[PDB]
């Protein structure tokens, strides 16, 4: 699988985004879909994912309540809906393929989007 992220961008705390990532030469089916976040010095970070084509989400302890995870009908796009935001949320976020089973370390996706920036000023 080929991901891009788009969605991204610069707004002030408490606004949304909308992060999708989409999938080239094949859907998403048989693959755990997963997003993660780099923040300026800091490692890569699980953020959320989505597997079994939805029987499973994930979501960070930092994060949950406030972005949802969802995929299409045609499972081409995985989507990140991001509310409530606030400045620490700020990062390159990242768009996550893997086959096999929905684990929260970066080390074992396979396929990787080139990112996408999130800014979130106060």
């Known amino acids: 699988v080929q991901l891009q992220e788009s969605g991204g961008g610069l707004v002030q705390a408490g606004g949304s985004l909308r992060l999708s990532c989409a999938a080239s030469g094949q859907t998403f089916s048989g693959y755990v879909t997963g997003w993660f976040r780099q923040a300026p010095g800091k490692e890569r970070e699980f953020v959320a994912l989505?597997?079994?084509?939805?029987?499973?989400?994930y979501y960070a302890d930092s994060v949950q309540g406030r972005f949802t995870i969802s995929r299409d009908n045609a499972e081409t796009t995985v989507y990140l809906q991001m509310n409530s935001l606030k400045p620490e949320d700020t990062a390159v976020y990242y768009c996550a393929a893997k086959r096999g089973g929905a684990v929260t370390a970066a080390e074992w996706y396979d396929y990787w989007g080139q990112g996408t920036q999130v800014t979130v000023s106060s």
């Open positions: 989505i597997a079994w084509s939805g029987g499973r989400l």
